[PDB]
Ligand SMILES: *[C@@H]1O[C@H](CO)[C@@H](O[C@@H]2O[C@H](CO)[C@@H](O[C@@H]3O[C@H](CO)[C@@H](O)[C@H](O[C@H]4O[C@H](CO)[C@@H](O)[C@H](O)[C@@H]4O)[C@@H]3O)[C@H](O)[C@H]2NC(C)=O)[C@H](O)[C@H]1NC(C)=O
Ligand SMILES: *[C@@H]1O[C@H](CO)[C@@H](O[C@@H]2O[C@H](CO)[C@@H](O[C@@H]3O[C@H](CO)[C@@H](O)[C@H](O[C@H]4O[C@H](CO)[C@@H](O)[C@H](O)[C@@H]4O)[C@@H]3O)[C@H](O)[C@H]2NC(C)=O)[C@H](O)[C@H]1NC(C)=O
Ligand SMILES: *[C@@H]1O[C@H](CO)[C@@H](O[C@@H]2O[C@H](CO)[C@@H](O)[C@H](O)[C@H]2NC(C)=O)[C@H](O)[C@H]1NC(C)=O
Ligand SMILES: *[C@@H]1O[C@H](CO)[C@@H](O)[C@H](O)[C@H]1NC(C)=O
């Protein structure tokens with residue numbers, strides 16, 4: 066036939082316009098397209114093409130001209146295919162049923178989509194994750210009332226009543242409308258869309274009316290989350306008898322939980338609003354079907370009602386960041402046969418942990434009790450129940466006393482263990498070495514004693530070891546060398562001894578090493594220079610000595626930084642108190658209230674400058690050290706000129722050592738430098754004029770040295786007070802007295 070002749074010539078013309086033709090190596094002239102990778106055939110005819118996640122790097126016009134006009138083509142999948150340009154008029158086969166152009170670079174007004182009316186059989190359209198917008202006046206209509214499924218999410222569509230524009234020429238056929246992640250506002254009226262099953266208008270700019278749903282006869286999924294809505298959503302959905310998922314989270318709803326349609330409800334989220342009061346008894350009506358409940362981040366209080374025992378299907382219950390109280394309602398929890406995630410964090414539950422909690426160890430995946438006022442010991446009998454499934458145990462920021470139950474080694478599925486901010490005494494059980502899947506061990510701010518267990522070597526998966534603020538002793542166990550995936554080691558504020566092992570150069574995943582305020586000693590191992598992920602090195606307040614090895618900077622410019630997305634807290638030191646040392650403590654802060662930072666004050670001579678966030682380096686490839694504090698040690702000799710080879714270095718603290726020689730002119734290359742402390746050393750010579758080039762300095766200290774001659778007049782030096790240059794006899798020039 067001709068369509069066969071035409072099919073093959075159309076496919077190859079397309080292949081030929083690709084900048085990297087090597088992309089479709091088995092597509093070739095004089096070969097049957099039904100044997101081509103990417104192609105689906107039925108009865109020797111092409112029915113589908115899927116070139117998704119291939120970087121075609123071509124424009125839509127190539128697509129519409131070569132592919133969309135193919136006789137008999139039923140679907141075209143081109144997600145994440147580096148297609149750019151915009152849609153416009155073309156000839157389109159009548160059999161084309163589905164078009165997926167998601168995750169591309171289509172641009173232009175969303176009205177360009179109207180030209181897909183050419184495709185008279187088009188029922189499913191995905192253009193999510195592009196840059197389609199809506200310039201100015203919202204008039205006319207999209208004119209694609211034949212669609213069953215339309216996804217316009219994650220575009221650049223900003224405007225009022227864009228939804229009216231989509232539905233203007235009818236929506237009797239529409240089953241699924243998604244338009245989340247834009248900047249759309251105004252009215253949402255889908256009452257004429259009597260077949261609509263799925264509506265997602267989340268993460269937009271709605272702040273007026275609640276969506277009008279009319280009879281709401283087929284609606285199963287309603288997501289209006291991530292807006293600024295308030296008002297009577299209860300009345301709006303009261304007719305929705307088929308509703309399975311209702312997500313109204315992250316809005317501005319206030320008041321108690323109002324009536325809800327419960328007979329079909331599987332997932333409910335009211336999280337991150339301003340709801341008040343107690344959980345009402347009438348919610349028992351969903352217990353036949355409810356699968357997920359989320360009430361987090363409101364102002365709820367009281368206790369978890371008894372009726373929840375009948376919710377035998379409830380898999381996850383999240384109630385964090387409210388004000389629930391009383392004891393852990395074990396009587397109710399134990400009936401929840403299907404429960405898998407339990408999150409009561411950031412409330413005021415109190416009392417000791419009930420013995421019966423040991424049964425849940427066999428059903429739960431996540432147990433999060435962090436940031437409550439629990440007291441007593443961690444259940445020793447925990448994970449007795451053979452076939453322990455528990456993966457995540459979060460008990461941080463409570464009032465637990467006693468030992469860390471070695472028993473915890475029986476929860477053999479554990480990937481994450483956070484017992485920080487408690488009053489735990491005793492040792493770190495050697496048996497934790499058994500947790501062969503453990504990635505995160507966080508035990509900081511307790512009273513743990515004894516040595517860091519050698520047996521940790523048995524945990525190949527270990528990524529974070531956070532042991533700060535305890536009473537630990539002994540040396541860094543050689544065993545940790547086997548833990549090659551470690552990316553965050555924090556041992557500060559203990560009483561550890563010995564040297565930094567040279568095997569540390571072996572850990573090529575290690576981004577953060579914090580060992581401040583201990584009694585570590587000897588030389589800084591040149592081997593640190595071998596760590597290719599290292600961006601945060603804190604050794605302040607120890608007994609280190611020898612000279613700073615030039616080699617430790619060999620990675621500069623070669624660093625790519627698995628460390629991001631972890632909640633941290635950075636407590637900046639004010640030079641006000643002399644007992645307070647270092648630039649500042651970077652600390653892990655998952656599941657802990659900042660209000661409880663005051664717990665540190667019995668363990669920390671530091672008075673109040675707090676920087677929150679989630680870890681997030683600034684480069685992605687070819688960066689360098691970002692933080693280097695080696696202050697308050699006994700380092701000597703001169704500063705290597707390779708010190709200047711770190712353009713991402715925000716902070717440099719070498720204060721309070723015995724460093725001598727002159728300041729290398731290469732310090733002037735540290736263009737990202739915010740802080741520079743070299744105070745209380747034996748540095749001499751001149752401040753290099755090269756340092757006039759730095760533009761990001763917020764703090765400098767060069768006081769208590771033997772520096773001499775004039776302070777550089779250009780750059781930022783005139784900006785700092787005399788105090789920063791005191792006790793340098795040969796030193797003159799503003800902010801000091803003019804030079805003789
Ligand atoms: C319109 O297009 C967008 C963009 O493609 C699309 O959104 C994406 O949908 C997919 C699912 O189709 C999402 O990817 C999933 O992510 C979850 C975890 O968040 C994974 O568990 C899923 O993996 C499953 O399936 C895989 C096979 O593909 C298996 O290998 C795996 O074992 C799992 O079984 C799955 O990858 C994706 O996150 C979204 N979001 C994006 C990319 O923005 C959207 O659904 C389309 N719209 C319509 C109406 O179809
Ligand atoms: C390195 O580690 C050691 C070990 O933590 C650390 O020494 C400790 O410092 C803290 C903080 O300065 C000290 O806390 C004190 O505890 C005594 C009782 O032992 C209290 O009487 C003191 O209370 C004062 O401060 C309170 C408010 O913070 C006031 O309410 C009260 O009225 C007092 O003014 C004080 O809190 C702790 O004693 C020491 N412990 C040891 C072992 O010395 C050291 O500071 C760390 N070094 C650095 C540079 O951080
Ligand atoms: C309920 O809606 C919330 C809020 O939109 C969802 O949480 C967000 O998920 C999006 C991606 O869809 C993320 O970009 C946001 O960071 C999330 N926000 C918050 C505050 O968590 C949530 O996933 C929805 N629940 C369900 C089951 O769909
Ligand atoms: C589309 O992508 C190509 C390849 O980078 C580029 O050269 C071209 O200018 C782009 N077209 C538009 C409309 O920006």
Ligand SMILES: *[C@@H]1O[C@H](CO)[C@@H](O)[C@H](O)[C@H]1NC(C)=O
Pocket residue numbers: 223225248250270
């Ligand atoms: C959201 O809508 C309001 C009112 O229409 C408008 O003034 C504002 O610019 C929009 N805000 C955002 C985040 O675009």
Ligand SMILES: *[C@@H]1O[C@H](CO)[C@@H](O)[C@H](O)[C@H]1NC(C)=O
Pocket residue numbers: 366388390413
């Ligand atoms: C939270 O609950 C406690 C205990 O019932 C109560 O005393 C306290 O006032 C509540 N907190 C707030 C902020 O209302």
